[PDB]
Design a binder for this molecule. Structure first.
Ligand SMILES: C[C@]1(O)CC[C@H]2[C@@H]3CCC4=CC(=O)CCC4=C3C=C[C@@]21C
Lengths: 243, 10
């Protein structure tokens, strides 16, 4: 009840990209629309995270830090879920007005990364992931990437992460063992994908002026101030299993 | 500080 009640209650609603589906697809248009969508989803991720059980237990600087580091993974995971429930993983459901078919995957020059995301979407089906498991996993995803040097108050974070793992346990509760194994394996699989996208969005920002791709305010800041911490190895994801 | 501003506005 309680824990799951909250997660269901705070789950972000539908978010549109504002893409003009009347114009023929193009690299600059598609990626710019994705960037706008990302900015819009970031606002929802912030509202969502600040409302999570026990989030205020974290030092304020850590609250902002984990959101910024986990942003990509959170979006990827939710998108995969949306693609699974809406189009049964046939296409990438970024938004109602921004659905990626093979042609767009190609036109966006993000084909390889889209293939990875589509595979993740397919796993929700192959694993018969329930909406309740999805909710708990996504919440745990927010607490799955931290600085190797530690956070301002690592202890409050460790405590919070531990409790979310316990909640996943309960939702699951030799079948419990196997379920926990595949769900943690699934969660781990998000990280390599998020890294690929981190590299891609970083390179895109650096050359955005040359390819006519627009980056919203917060995104440009986060991608140039925080993401490089991840790409340079200062900030790393927390894996359940050894990669 | 674009993110912190958002963070503090919601
Ligand atoms: C296009 C790009 O810059 C590179 C990878 C893109 C990512 C891919 C993951 C993603 C999932 C969503 O459901 C919202 C938008 C979204 C993105 C928006 C902009 C990014 C960060």
């Amino acid at each position: 009840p309680i824990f799951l009640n909250v997660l269901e209650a705070i789950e972000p609603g539908v978010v549109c990209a504002g893409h003009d589906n009347n114009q023929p697809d193009s690299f600059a248009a598609l990626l710019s629309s994705l960037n706008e969508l990302g900015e819009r989803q970031l606002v929802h991720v912030v509202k969502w995270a600040k409302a999570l059980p026990g989030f205020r237990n974290l030092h304020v600087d850590d609250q902002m830090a984990v959101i910024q580091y986990s942003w990509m993974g959170l979006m990827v995971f939710a998108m995969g879920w949306r693609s699974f429930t809406n189009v049964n993983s046939r296409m990438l459901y970024f938004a109602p007005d921004l659905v990626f078919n093979e042609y767009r995957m190609h036109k966006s020059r993000m084909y390889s990364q889209c293939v990875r995301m589509r595979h993740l979407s397919q796993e929700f089906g192959w694993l018969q992931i329930t909406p309740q498991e999805f909710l708990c996993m996504k919440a745990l995803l927010l607490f799955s990437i931290i600085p190797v040097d530690g956070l301002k108050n690592q202890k409050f974070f460790d405590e919070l992460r531990m409790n979310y793992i316990k909640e996943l346990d309960r939702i699951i509760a030799t079948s419990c063992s196997r379920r926990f194994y595949q769900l943690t394996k699934l969660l781990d699989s998000v990280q390599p994908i998020a890294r690929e996208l981190h590299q891609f969005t970083f390179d895109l920002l650096i050359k955005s002026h040359m390819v006519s791709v627009d980056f919203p305010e917060m995104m440009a800041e986060i991608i140039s101030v925080q993401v490089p911490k991840i790409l340079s190895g200062k900030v790393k994801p927390i894996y359940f299993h050894t990669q | 500080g674009a993110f912190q501003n958002l963070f503090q506005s919601v």
